[PDB]
Amino acid sequence: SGFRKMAFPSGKVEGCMVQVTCGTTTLNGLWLDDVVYCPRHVICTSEDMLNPNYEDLLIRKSNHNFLVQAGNVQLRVIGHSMQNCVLKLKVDTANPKTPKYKFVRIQPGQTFSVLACYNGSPSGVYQCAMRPNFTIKGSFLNGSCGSVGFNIDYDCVSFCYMHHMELPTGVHAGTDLEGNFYGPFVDRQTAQAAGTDTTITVNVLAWLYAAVINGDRWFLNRFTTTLNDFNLVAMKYNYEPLTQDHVDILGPLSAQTGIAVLDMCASLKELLQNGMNGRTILGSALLEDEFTPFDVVRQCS
Amino acid sequence: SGFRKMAFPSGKVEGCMVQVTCGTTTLNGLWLDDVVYCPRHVICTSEDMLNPNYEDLLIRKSNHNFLVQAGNVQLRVIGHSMQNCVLKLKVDTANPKTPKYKFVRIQPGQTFSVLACYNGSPSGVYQCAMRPNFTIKGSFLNGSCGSVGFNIDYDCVSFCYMHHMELPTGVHAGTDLEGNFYGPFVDRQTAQAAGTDTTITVNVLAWLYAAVINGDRWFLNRFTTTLNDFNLVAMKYNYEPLTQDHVDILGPLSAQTGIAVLDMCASLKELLQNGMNGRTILGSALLEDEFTPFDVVRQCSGVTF
Numbered sequence: 001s002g003f004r005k006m007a008f009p010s011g012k013v014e015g016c017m018v019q020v021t022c023g024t025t026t027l028n029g030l031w032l033d034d035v036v037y038c039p040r041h042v043i044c045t046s047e048d049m050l051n052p053n054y055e056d057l058l059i060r061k062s063n064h065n066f067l068v069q070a071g072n073v074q075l076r077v078i079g080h081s082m083q084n085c086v087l088k089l090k091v092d093t094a095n096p097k098t099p100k101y102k103f104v105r106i107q108p109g110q111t112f113s114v115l116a117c118y119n120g121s122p123s124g125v126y127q128c129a130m131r132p133n134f135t136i137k138g139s140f141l142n143g144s145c146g147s148v149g150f151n152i153d154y155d156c157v158s159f160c161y162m163h164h165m166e167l168p169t170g171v172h173a174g175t176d177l178e179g180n181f182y183g184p185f186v187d188r189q190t191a192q193a194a195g196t197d198t199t200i201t202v203n204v205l206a207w208l209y210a211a212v213i214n215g216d217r218w219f220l221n222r223f224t225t226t227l228n229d230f231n232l233v234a235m236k237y238n239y240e241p242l243t244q245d246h247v248d249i250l251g252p253l254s255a256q257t258g259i260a261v262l263d264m265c266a267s268l269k270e271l272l273q274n275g276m277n278g279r280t281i282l283g284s285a286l287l288e289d290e291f292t293p294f295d296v297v298r299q300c301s
Numbered sequence: 302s303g304f305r306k307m308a309f310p311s312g313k314v315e316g317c318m319v320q321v322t323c324g325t326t327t328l329n330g331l332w333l334d335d336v337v338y339c340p341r342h343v344i345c346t347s348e349d350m351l352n353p354n355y356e357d358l359l360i361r362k363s364n365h366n367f368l369v370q371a372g373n374v375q376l377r378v379i380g381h382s383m384q385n386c387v388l389k390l391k392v393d394t395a396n397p398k399t400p401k402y403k404f405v406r407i408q409p410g411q412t413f414s415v416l417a418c419y420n421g422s423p424s425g426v427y428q429c430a431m432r433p434n435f436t437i438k439g440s441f442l443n444g445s446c447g448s449v450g451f452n453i454d455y456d457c458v459s460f461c462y463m464h465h466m467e468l469p470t471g472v473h474a475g476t477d478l479e480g481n482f483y484g485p486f487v488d489r490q491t492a493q494a495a496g497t498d499t500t501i502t503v504n505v506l507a508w509l510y511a512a513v514i515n516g517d518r519w520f521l522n523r524f525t526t527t528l529n530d531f532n533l534v535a536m537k538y539n540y541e542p543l544t545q546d547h548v549d550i551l552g553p554l555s556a557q558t559g560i561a562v563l564d565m566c567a568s569l570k571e572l573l574q575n576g577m578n579g580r581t582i583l584g585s586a587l588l589e590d591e592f593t594p595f596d597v598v599r600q601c602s603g604v605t606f
């Protein structure tokens with residue numbers, strides 16, 4: 001029993017983290033096979049940041065301008081190329097610690113673990129969700145760019161996020177491992193801001209089911225709702241609209257507990273209306289939206 | 302910026318987890334050098350766990366009763382012995398992945414990372430605190446016994462917890478790696494409950510500093526107070542006492558932030574007696590007590606391993 005926000009064991013990713021330096025810029029890279037992946041803004045100077053011409057800056061670079069450092073070992077860069085916002089550094093030796101891996105691009109609402117790193121060295125690991133506005137609410141200091149987010153399935157690491165920058169509001173933006181940003185963001189210091197954040201409704205419902213599975217029933221009620229009536233209400237609380245696909249995703253948990261999805265939706269509407277009234281659910285005084293339907297079956301009985 | 306409940310990276314410990322079976326019981330063991338550590342209640346049957354005589358159960362067992370699995374490899378047990386509530390299984394070959402490590406006993410209010418495993422296979426990692434009532438509010442399913450808790454200092458793993466059982470209320474109880482229980486519990490299937498719990502005051506203060514560091518500062522006020530003054534109100538609310546040791550431990554955060562520790566205690570005193578309005582702190586409507594002052598310094602300054 002019990003319910004914690006749980007990250008994946010970080011060992012397989014720890015064995016891939018290296019340090020990458022251009023002039024006075026140092027950040028992290030991901031060393032898989034004979035390729036080191038990192039953010040391309042490592043090649044900028046602070047004078048470039050406003051309107052960097054990345055292709056012009058890269059053409060001027062030589063292999064030996066890139067110092068890659070794995071532990072004590074300096075790695076020899078034998079080639080370099082650019083794919084979208086990610087720099088790809090060919091090195092002369094394959095990482096022996098390379099795990100089974102794949103690059104995946106995730107959807108808002110999906111969760112993953114972050115291995116926060118500085119100077120190629122892991123600082124800590126924590127569990128995150130991609131927000132509906134395509135940012136993540138991470139914990140990132142200067143030097144953290146190139147830290148990656150991942151899930152692990154059996155023994156295969158799926159890389160889904162690389163950290164690139166912190167927006168002025170204090171949240172974080174980055175790319176998949178093919179260098180395409182999540183969201184309408186670009187890697188230059190120009191005015192940009194995320195959409196209004198919203199609550200990940202399907203994740204909240206999944207978490208209410210987890211609470212029922214662990215024995216809390218104090219928030220259930222006798223009501224049911226239509227999908228459209230629920231969305232009309234939830235959106236007035238800045239909750240994401242719920243789709244029929246979300247309703248189908250919740251099938252298993254609704255079966256396992258004997259509570260229809262639109263019954264649970266009625267409970268959610270009432271919680272938004274009344275609050276918690278001094279009580280908690282799985283240890284939170286707030287409705288938690290960073291557990292997926294999949295995570296709930298993962299952690300739960 | 303940002304502030305997250307953050308665990309230590311778990312790589313050095315993942316390489317030590319193995320499976321241990323006696324009869325129809327399977328749980329996790331910790332493989333360091335040529336010794337596997339795990340809970341001694343692995344030698345108990347159904348009838349045994351109601352009132353076990355462990356030395357007699359262990360006498361009757363022999364090396365080949367212990368089935369030890371390191372992934373697909375199998376370790377040959379060449380000796381067995383007990384230290385307190387932990388079983389020590391000597392194997393023929395040393396773990397090549399053994400990290401620099403030591404065994405430590407922690408204090409209530411100290412935090413650590415838990416690597417929850419099943420069938421010797423690590424599954425998830427999370428951060429938690431040793432409660433003042435010597436329980437931990439973990440998340441374990443059947444088969445998690447033998448999972449460990451640890452801290453990393455520089456390059457050295459400090460093992461501080463081994464998981465033994467779930468209590469009837471859903472909180473968890475275990476030992477240090479020398480098999481000494483945390484709190485007044487026994488490894489036997491009998492009625493047991495934890496004492497009333499309290500809030501780790503120095504950790505709440507540290508968390509308030511983390512909120513200020515991150516720009517959340519509506520709760521700061523003009524007043525100061527004193528330990529004797531704060532502690533009279535605090536104990537009323539089931540809060541641990543604040544000691545001069547706690548104040549000096551916060552000095553770095555006060556310094557980094559410009560808010561003196563006795564000034565911050567005036568803020569916490571007021572949140573107790575008034576609560577929060579409709580407001581949150583670092584996105585929480587509860588007062589958070591599972592971050593130590595060192596945790597906040599390490600996270601808000603970038604310390605790596």
Ligand SMILES: O=c1[nH]cc(-c2cc(-c3cc(Cl)c(F)c(OCc4ccccc4Cl)c3)c(=O)n(-c3cccnc3)c2)c(=O)[nH]1
Binds near residue numbers: 041140189
């Ligand atoms: O040697 C190194 N130099 C710099 C960094 C670094 C760089 C950035 C960064 C990168 C790019 Cl491309 C930007 F457009 C950018 O502008 C931000 C902004 C300002 C006003 C309006 C819009 C925007 Cl977006 C910033 C960064 O956000 N962080 C960083 C800091 C804290 C947390 N997480 C990450 C680090 C580093 O890690 N190492």
